[PDB]
Subunit: 368 residues, 4 copies
């Protein structure tokens, strides 16, 4: 049934998404065509449970959607990937009352969700965040700022971490759902980036941002716990994204090298090139299987998830650098897509925990 | 599958691991492993149940090979070569011939070898020179083979020989040869880098007459059957490599936690932590791709995935075992610890059942199809 | 002596080139400030012999100039690197009469030179070029086109290879000096590129382009020999450029990781980060030494030059990918330069012969 | 001068050393033929200053000798590499009076020297050594033990580090010349090893080993400082050894792949093989140039470059020798050819004279200073 799912999303991606991926990048503009196609086909947030009108897709299927979209446009693949990132905490730990306000809109395609953890002085060290939430009667008052927020300015709902008790450290962070129209909440300017150019990446500001008491996810002081829980059920989807990029770059190189002739023969006739292609495909398949395994394990209940994400992203970086190479001069131009794929691949090694952090998680598990 | 793993690991750690050092040091057959594998029925679990076998699925067979290789790679070649030396027969042999051979392999009474390579026909196996000529209702084998794993310990041998020099690879046939067939002899063993205890021998055929029913499938399909065999066996060498790497990593985690320099375990250093993470991450990717390739082989382009799984796992093992020696420091460079042997053993996995260059030829041909 | 030279070029590069490098990339425009500073300091073409008013510098000194410029702006470094690429053939084999017309202007900074070998269907396989030259009276008539031409539209002089006898293969190719003002010579559109964005990269067209008989370089039929000789004396300079990029990336990462704190300490206090920095610096220094050795050997009169170029560029691709990684999220933005350095490093593996071609060259020598 | 030196050592090594290398390794016995030839040709310790009867060769020339010996026999290359390691401290910091006693014998080939720093609990963390030296009138009494000692049992002179003040940490360590005939000094059993098998690698024991006051190198408490300075001047020579091993591996692979024919053509006719050969040679030359640069700078008047030269070259040798075994296929995995031994030998170069993890500590400290 994943065979059929893959055929469906690939057909959708190639027809409605792929033709605009070069513009989305070149012009650094939101992938609107992709959003419309994902929303109307119901592929924008398949992970949302059926109870809220979602597909209730299993975790492997969700990875397959992200991977197949990323295979033609990595900025577009951040629509389903951050929809998951921005709703996973709520799903796992949120109250039914809160879930009902948010999930049906994400499930139906009416709203996107973003995830707001990071701050200028708190990236890898997320627990040193400075944004705070102070109770005030029935409300929470948010003050501070966040940065690196994917789909900032396009999302309707934001999962936002803030300090509710500074003296409890990691155990004094809470998570809140913030709506875009909430007073005191503003979206900052977009970053200029190496790749995923069309994906808006913004600062956010909270100046006495008053939100209802029902917006808190779980008990106060459980926000960091929830952040870690979020990442366990999302890191493989960034692995799936890296796998898709890699696959698209390999697909392009195979097609091009077969058709491009030098020395009176296809450049793919040269065993140096054949071996490079083999190495790219071998590692992509290994990375894909570890992604799916990590995803299936997460669903059923740190090592495998960090591994799947670290490995697939390392693989995508090598594969896309090789794919640019196999096109020769044309690979270095915007006329072909592999140049964009290479710039996009680099982010997968950085967000949803840097690959150095993934190695920290992995080694801690091995050595415990 | 978990219960299988627990059972084979216990046997390997209890009955095989204590002899692994001496197996290598003396370059002598792992007899203790053979007795334990044979009597607990772990030596050839792939043989179909119709012939007295466990009829285990191909992933189960990989897990057995992997868990044995984790403690002794020479020993792992008992089940791995039991499979190599019977797979052609299982795939393409007649009931009449299968019934003669497989029950003894199924029971642990007989090991099987696979005799394909010659001095001048390694990668280019189709250029082999050993001949088979039809005589009445018999075949007369003349020639020699080399690099034959478990040579001199095996009872049954799958031998390829030319039936028609004119027909190229379409003029190769495959035959089951028995240790007691007259004019069949075993030559000297190779002096090797690793898997030192696995006998690796030449074989001689001197007017070696065998019954006509010994042929596997039709005359001239022997190379085709050789290629199909590798499709179904390449992942098991992947599994072997995964096992070796796992054992090297297990030894390095245990040792780096215990060994202290500068007032703390050597594992306390982030450079060592990252290297351990790299080892484990890559081992798990290799493992999953081995099991996937095995699952797909059993169900019926296995070409790409089986070559991939063998090539990647063996590359991973080489890197992991090189690292594990490194993590022990000077002790890792001594025979006092097993990681030195593990490194030496890991190297063969990149070479046999198709060198990793040949694996890349198979993979790229599939992609460029 | 070279120490003094390195100090001078570095000071020049820091003060007059570096402040414009971001803008040169972001606006994809020619590094005009770098041109003015290099021309007036006399750093634009120091390889030109003294006989023509040039500096007459040794080949290592030329590499150090290219390296130190590439350390702050790769597009800018193509000024001296392609001034060299576009005059070496002439210098090695051209008549005195021809050299007197071209070289003094390049030496004085009045003219830039370009090198025009490649065509759409003749890249790695340059010998299959289709641009034609036909003798007509005392002149040559050139017809056809070239592409990938660095500094196209900015150069005054172009070294152009063309077929003079179609039946002689590589031995029926000649090389000619073409002047930007020659009738029937026109410059095409600029490529849109992954990196080195400010370096113009253009098609050229020859439409009954009539040039004097004195424009041929050496004897008819020796043009390809002269192209191969050029690469022998230029490939180490692309190694030098890749060393420069890598060094700038490493300088950046050292400065940033010392100042950026997470978990209460500089990120450079992590041993994984320390080891990565050690790896970058070790490979850079190996690459640098092999470049200078190739340069010294070429100048005193295939393997070492191909090795110096392949190795340094593979190193720079690795080092710049790591430098982006070590800046974390900031590395992925245009606010810092490591992202530009990564995009730029990729070209070094492709031009003046792809690293695959370099391995053809090397293995042929080993196996001779 | 260097072109000629290289030619002279290469010819000597090919004639007098190469023919014995396989036996030295296989039988784990000292390379006696190489010692005799290096001694009588005057190549055993060319770094020794002219003032003590030595050749007084520059540091690049000393690397070239070590490199070209290592190219055919790594164990034999440890004669001049360790003759340098076990005298450099003395040369740099010792009194004229002591130098005159030790250096002429090393210069003339009458004596080998060893370096005795490491202990079972003091490897990377050498400053935590436990061997003590106690003053007794004008003399010193040594008590403790060393391990990992190359050429132990063969050397005549040993540079030994010992604690002279347990309260001063690293500044409580001293260095002493110990003679093989000093009473209370004994040599323990040899390690069994992955490679450099013919190189003796021993424990040493000091039991009330009384030595004269003139045997101390430099002032008391500066022995560890002397250890660090020594490594600055010797690390490139292990880079040079790794470069020789890799060069021998590459040379062997070139000659072999050109002559081994499969599929109707030399195996070197395949581009995947050509490219690997190209990668091997390119990295070897980069490694060589950095070693010579490191050596040349050490001589002139260094932390970063000596560590980089050794780390890079040893990493290169490990990759290159793993590749060279691969390129021989089956034959590479056998003792019939030398690439298997070269592979085993390469591994030590990443470990001794400071592991490559320690080299990265040293490099990164210099970068972040
Ligand atoms: C385009 C884009 C998009 C997103 C994001 C980033 C970017 C660039 N992120 C933020 C992302 O998760 C974040 O960038 C990483 O956690 C890394 O943090 P810093 O950028 O602060 O680097 P930081 O300063 O943490 O790291 C600097 C370098 O040091 C290394 N390092 C740090 N600690 C180390 C340690 N203990 N050991 C070894 N090395 C260590 C790092 O690996 C890195 O190489 C995000 N966030 C969010 O909340 N919502 C979002 O939607 C997104 N989306
Ligand atoms: C920005 C920029 C700037 C310049 C240039 C290019 C670019 C992109 N070049 C042209 C450059 O030298 C050219 O891109 C390369 O020679 C490769 O040619 P193709 O782009 O046609 O790739 P091509 O189609 O040759 O190669 C495609 C792939 O096949 C591989 N391949 C080809 N043959 C192979 C073989 N036999 N064995 C193994 N692999 C093989 C290649 O390595 C590559 O990965 C140039 N030119 C010029 O005349 N003047 C200039 O100034 C410049 N400058
Ligand atoms: C210990 C041991 C155990 C066994 C075996 C070997 C060994 C060493 N073998 C034999 C094994 O399968 C054989 O060694 C390989 O197929 C390679 O053949 P050669 O050793 O002749 O190397 P060969 O000479 O074919 O290869 C030499 C080098 O050239 C490369 N090469 C060759 N052709 C190439 C091409 N077209 N493109 C790129 N590169 C190419 C190879 O990759 C290798 O690097 C075997 N056999 C058997 O019948 N029964 C058994 O039980 C075993 N077991
Ligand atoms: C054959 C042979 C020959 C010689 C030598 C060894 C051998 C095997 N040695 C000793 C050698 O120098 C010694 O093995 C190394 O210094 C490493 O010490 P240990 O073996 O105790 O490993 P140790 O236990 O120190 O290291 C184990 C692992 O931990 C790692 N590690 C340790 N500290 C670390 C840190 N701070 N950060 C990151 N990683 C760290 C190491 O890199 C290694 O990977 C020697 N000695 C001598 O005195 N005279 C001699 O002649 C020779 N000869």
């Amino acid at each position: 049934e994943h065979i059929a799912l893959r055929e469906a999303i690939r057909a959708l991606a190639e027809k409605e998404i792929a033709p605009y991926a070069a513009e989305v990048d070149e012009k650094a503009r939101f992938p609107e065509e992709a959003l419309a196609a994902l929303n109307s086909s119901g592929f924008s947030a398949i992970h949302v449970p059926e109870e809220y009108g979602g597909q209730g897709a299993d975790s492997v299927a969700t990875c397959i959607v992200i991977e197949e979209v990323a295979r033609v446009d990595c900025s577009a693949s951040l629509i389903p990937a951050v929809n998951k990132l921005g709703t996973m905490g709520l799903i796992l730990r949120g109250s039914e009352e809160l879930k009902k306000q948010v999930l049906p809109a994400v499930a139906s395609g009416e709203a996107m969700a973003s995830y707001a953890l990071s701050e200028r002085e708190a990236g890898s060290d997320a627990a040193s965040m400075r944004t705070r939430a102070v109770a005030d009667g029935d409300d929470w008052i948010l003050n501070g700022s966040k940065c690196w927020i994917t789909n900032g300015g396009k999302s309707t709902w934001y999962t936002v971490m803030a300090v509710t008790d500074p003296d409890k450290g990691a155990n004094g962070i809470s998570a809140f759902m913030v709506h875009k129209d909430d007073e005191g909440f503003t979206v900052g300017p977009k970053e200029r980036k190496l790749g995923i150019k069309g994906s808006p990446t913004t600062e956010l500001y909270f100046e006495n941002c008053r939100i209802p008491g029902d917006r808190i996810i779980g008990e106060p002081g459980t926000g960091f716990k929830t952040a870690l829980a979020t990442l366990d059920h999302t890191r493989p989807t960034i692995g799936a994204q890296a796998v898709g990029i890699a696959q698209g770059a390999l697909d392009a190189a195979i097609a091009y090298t077969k058709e491009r002739k030098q020395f009176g023969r296809p450049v793919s006739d040269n065993q140096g090139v054949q071996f490079m292609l083999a190495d790219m495909a071998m590692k992509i398949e290994a990375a894909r299987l570890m992604v799916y395994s990590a995803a299936a394990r997460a669903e059923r209940g740190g090592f495998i998830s960090a591994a799947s994400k670290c490995f697939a992203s390392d693989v995508a970086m090598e594969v896309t650098t090789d794919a640019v190479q196999l096109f020769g001069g044309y690979g270095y131009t915007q006329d072909f897509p592999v140049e964009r794929m290479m710039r996009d691949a680099k982010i997968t090694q950085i967000y949803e925990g840097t690959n150095q952090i993934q190695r920290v998680v992995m080694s801690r598990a091995l050595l415990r």
